[model samples]
Target: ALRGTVTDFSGFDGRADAEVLRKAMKGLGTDEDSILNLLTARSNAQRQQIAEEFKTLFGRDLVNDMKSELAGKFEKLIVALMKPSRLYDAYELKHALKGAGTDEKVLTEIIASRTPEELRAIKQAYEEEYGSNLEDDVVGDTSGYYQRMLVVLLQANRDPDTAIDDAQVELDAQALFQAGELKWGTDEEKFITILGTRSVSHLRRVFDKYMTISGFQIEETIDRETSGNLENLLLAVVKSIRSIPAYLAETLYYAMKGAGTDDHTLIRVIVSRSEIDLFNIRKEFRKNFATSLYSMIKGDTSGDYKKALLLLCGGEDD
Candidate 1:
């Protein structure tokens, strides 16, 4: 039912048979195209079943075969398709960006678009697998506004599930005071720590309470209190907190319209974020702009870069 011929049924257990599955795939030569088609089309459950069976039948791992047969973006696509664990995803992302010729797009996408939950999982996975914090790695690899944005986004673990709390009005006011106001004003460390650490959902609740207590929005307060690059970074957090799609649209617009197009930022934002909240982003883009994100990208870019962006954006024609 899923595509591809069952060339070796010797290990058909309805459940996967490792040895028999391996034997079936052995000399038949790996069909890279078919593998892509089948894996992409198959659900996670189906892929897991096939992977288990391949190991049982062939006495080899599907991931191992993928590593052996594929290279570059094609390889990245196949491995990502396998969707191992959050740690594995982090590892793959690191591998994509490290050494010579880093894939900035992949890095940007992964950092910019992931939800707090996904980011938390990635952090845990990275620490588990690599014996170091992903945040440290990210800090090491990126710089300037991009780095600041990523660090803040990663730190602000605003889980969407968090509910507003009214009793915390004074507490929220005090915390905002420490981070954004009081004397010298804007403690970058406290701001980053609180924003980075709190779940989005929790922050949403906090924001609601802050508005109620102060009778003015957090944005207006930040605008009055903050300045320079840090101001921009803080604003991004506010925008993203308010609505991720709106934040993404603004980022996308700048990436395309800047003095020089930021293809890296454009591609990274589209591809990495697509799996997470892109479906929601698409809906929001249409509602807010009266034009689809897909159409916007189509109109803005072209050639291979455009094609790759469109494909990753989940464009229909792609």
Candidate 2:
């Protein structure tokens, strides 16, 4: 509740806002600020209302009209801002899979971080939009244990019970140890089964016990035992279970760091988490990366895209 940067606009009037946007995009050139300020401030639900009213009043699709007006990364950010969260995630997943090379980072971040209910909704949206099962698409694109992990996550049947069984946590921890450090060849299935099915609360306890028993962090073992996409997925799962905001903070950092900015990931994380945990993500960003997310955006981006993101970012953490 205290975590979201984007909240429902208190003085919401869908028709009036729609009219403002209509006027902004109506004439020569475009009022980028008008579009950015209004859409970024309103929650997605309010944006939906505005979109409907935009159609009724202007006889045009709000999104299509905006697309005509905006260009480049600015356009991408604006369009992503317009989508409902579940459908947005589905679109991101599809983009990752169908692109020239699989964006395993996108796949890992999305599949690992989403809750079961969120995952279920994304799967449905993927099927409806692409006319193929999300899992089948993942299967076709990826192979081996990585594919298995994605398939398990797509099932969206993670055990939801929060009540942790102490004995079971210890057993799971021991099982994980044996699966990796205690054995010669790694039992990848054991790692997948235990990590994939357990609730976050349960797995936190298991990781605690795992360190006590194995004398190594669970993450360290994953790094040593696994390689490639499977390793990335497992590490993502571990990090998500531990703290999603921290994991996402890391994702955000990498998206902006290194040569060119990963604008897609930067937009996706900022847009999707804006209404959820971006507040905490900002805190984590400041703490871990030693820079405010606000300043990072200012430094790495320019023009209307940066302006819209700054609004969504809300304010400085540092």
Candidate 3:
């Protein structure tokens, strides 16, 4: 489809020429949804080239144009499509919940669905763009478990090449000991910093080693040491780290079965992850909850909303 569109606009030098680019830009303003629908589906390299062509042809940045044309979470996704930088991903997330109106969809999608490598690149880009750590920005923007989870996500390094240095593990263990098991009995800052900042795969290994050295799971130590909402938040981080799909399933179960369905959470999780981890999330939901995510959505929601979610869930795999 993309090749066909590009071919139709020949003389682009495999890059849009001035006339062809202008047509694309004009199409963007009048048919913005189509532009987003087509461009975002293209590879990142293709999107990057198209962005440059839009600038050459229209004498304006494509991102700025799209920003003017769209709004809310949809706009957020469009902007994400334009940015070549992973930092653009972080920026989208930061804007989603920075002020009074929080777009929880953006938050859950970006944080829950990204691999550790993608996240690490995002962190690097975020620091380069803003001259500050992404975690600090997240802390300034959100609160409670949401804040902690985002902070931890920023800290996680999924790239397997991000080796688990023995020295670092010892250092982390020291911090964990100080936070939970040391004579002082607990240091909240240390706990939050270490747990919310270590990479997931690294943390998994670290936890295994910590158990060998300390004779207990990190959860037991946290439970023994921490209390209240902070503990709950910490527990959520642990669960998210261990298995995000299971955590999501648990979250969904509550959202649907509660006083009223949290349609926002439901829609956010399904749409944001549809192309990424929905398949894995489905497996996890079935394995852990013994109920398919499709059935849960069907049982809880109605009308167009339910239909939308069902299609997103891939509709019984047929």
Candidate 4:
């Protein structure tokens, strides 16, 4: 599920990357452009190699050296880059649980959005780094239906790669319709199994079939039936099945909407999507919101932060 725009690296030289970063941070004043270009242009794998070489050649911590040289959003962006993908995810999870009020949304976002492989890595990373079971952490932090779905997501073993069976899709759609508001109350376990375990392609067809049968979108039925985090969780799965990029774009809108900026979410989406599918998220965000995400970022932020963000967006949703 992680998509970075860093697929087509040519002449990828870890030694060259290390040299450039070292040169950029060599003297008194830092070459911010050189620093930004070096880090932003390379993939995480490449950057990791460069970081290894940089430390070996200079016997200096690349992260520490940059800390001394960089400032503002530039620093945050670079530091985020320094974190290996899985470890950073663990950092986010750890960060989420550290403060007084729990960040259920962060937990849900990471847990629910990842593919099985990705989630497995993050779960292991969390256990390795924090010495805490990630699932248990979720169980302890959240309550009610929210906690239930969160635990299921922690398994990350949903068979999303299965082939679509039109017949099964139809039955699942009917199964879902029968299980929800149309019934006397709901069969939440069946709802959970139907929604959570199906393949994305399967669920997409199921929703399509359900719409033809029920005369309302599956999302509509979900809204009519469920409430709170459960609704959000189920809808997230549906949206992810339909279009992860669009779903993420919606996430960005929500983060920037209302009274204040959710910096955590804003930074996470931008940083995580930067290499993978920030382009896709940007396109969907603009089409859905009728405004450039670039402009929104500009309005909500300033200085290096905006600069770093705009760079990730690659100058709006072109």
**All models, RMSD in angstroms:** 7.6, 1.5, 7.7, 2.8
TM values, all candidates: 0.57, 0.95, 0.56, 0.87
Winning candidate number (lDDT):
2
- Of the two candidates 1 and 3, the one with more favorable TM-score, higher being better, is 1
Question: Counting only residues 3 or more apart in sequence or on different chains, how many pairs clash (N, Cα, C under 3 Å) in candidate 4?
Answer: 5
lDDT of 2 by residue, 182-297 (tens): 89989999999988988878899999999999899999999999999899999999998988898999988988887779898899999999888889888888999999999998
Candidate 4, clashing residue pairs?
3-276, 4-275, 4-276, 5-275, 5-276
Clashing pairs in 2: none
Runs with alpha carbons beyond 4 Å of true place in candidate 4: 1-3, 7-9, 12-31, 68-73, 160-163, 257-260, 315-317
- Supply candidate 4's per-residue lDDT for 316: 51
The clash count of every prediction, one per candidate, is 25, 0, 2, 5
Better of 3 and 4 by lDDT: 4
Task: Give per-residue lDDT, candidate 4, residue 4.
Answer: 52
Give the clashing pairs for model 3: 12-15, 116-158
Off by over 4 Å in 2: none
Tens digit per residue, CA lDDT, model 1, 95-204:
75568655655555456556766778888887887787877877787676556667777764453454555555457556876566454755666566555556666677
Q: Which ten-residue region of model 4 has the weakest summed lDDT?
A: 1-10
Candidate order, lDDT descending: 2, 4, 3, 1
Q: lDDT tens digits, residues 214-241, model 3?
A: 8988889878987764666666667777
> Candidate 2: deviation at residue 243, Å?
0.8
